[PDB]
UniProtKB/TrEMBL annotation:
The name this protein goes by in its record: Predicted phosphatase, HAD family
Domain of life of the source: Bacteria
Organism: Clostridium acetobutylicum (strain ATCC 824 / DSM 792 / JCM 1419 / IAM 19013 / LMG 5710 / NBRC 13948 / NRRL B-527 / VKM B-1787 / 2291 / W)
GO cellular component, one term: cytosol
Cross-referenced Pfam families: HAD_2
GO MF: protein tyrosine kinase activity
InterPro entries from the UniProt entry: HAD-like_hydrolase_sf, HAD-like_sf, HAD_2, HAD_sf, PGP-like_dom2
């Protein structure tokens, strides 16, 4: 069952971006006079499309969530994206995989423009064949839609790739594209969240992730 492609989500899988993201959300919510006790309570915003999150957690409508997304970006584009860190072992993982011959791709709900700046900023950009994110306008943004477009763009077949993510959204997006998925628990999703989502494989560390990708 040799497959050549490995798709990765960005936030919570490759980078520990909680600080910058939760701070951008807090900055945005505060503009609505919504206070938050501690950033940690905004961790759930890490991974899914911002729109879905603002609407779900704050009952905003389409247009209001869009305004909230813009405030978020005022801070994220200039400070938030940098209040980030690459998970330990990740670059080692990426290097090892390309050596094996795997083609690596980023498939994320995060806007492509930010994802590229971040990966280049962290010097990991060239490990990837493509970095496919959402469009700033949100026309293309759900996990299912970005994975589908990434596969279409690179002409990747369902039997030649797997999806790596930390949230149920990644599992659902993978399933919807007929791709097996490896969920990681070192991110912002829990074992239970991934198991109930249907994750095809679940690991608790980057090293475990490395091993699993191979024996797959
Ligand atoms: Cl973002
Ligand atoms: Na994620």
């Amino acid at each position: 069952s040799l497959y050549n492609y490995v798709l990765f989500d960005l936030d919570g899988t490759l980078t520990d971006s909680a600080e910058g993201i939760t701070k951008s959300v807090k900055y945005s919510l505060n503009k609505f006079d919504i206070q938050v006790e501690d950033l940690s309570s905004l961790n759930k915003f890490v991974g899914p499309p911002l729109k879905t999150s603002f609407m779900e957690y704050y009952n905003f409508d389409e247009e209001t969530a869009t305004v909230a997304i813009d405030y978020y970006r005022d801070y994220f584009k200039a400070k938030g994206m940098f209040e980030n860190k690459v998970y330990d072992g990740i670059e080692a993982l990426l290097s090892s995989l390309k050596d094996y011959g795997f083609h690596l791709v980023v498939a994320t709900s995060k806007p492509t423009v930010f994802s590229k700046q971040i990966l280049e900023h962290f010097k990991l950009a060239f490990y990837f064949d493509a970095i496919v994110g959402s469009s700033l306008d949100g026309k293309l943004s759900t996990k299912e839609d970005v994975i589908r477009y990434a596969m279409e763009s690179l002409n990747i077949k369902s039997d030649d790739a797997i999806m790596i993510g930390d949230r149920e959204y990644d599992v659902i997006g993978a399933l919807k594209n007929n791709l097996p998925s490896i969920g990681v628990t070192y991110g912002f999703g829990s074992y239970e969240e991934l198991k109930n989502a249907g994750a095809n494989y679940i690991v608790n560390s980057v090293d475990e992730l490395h091993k699993k990708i191979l024996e797959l």
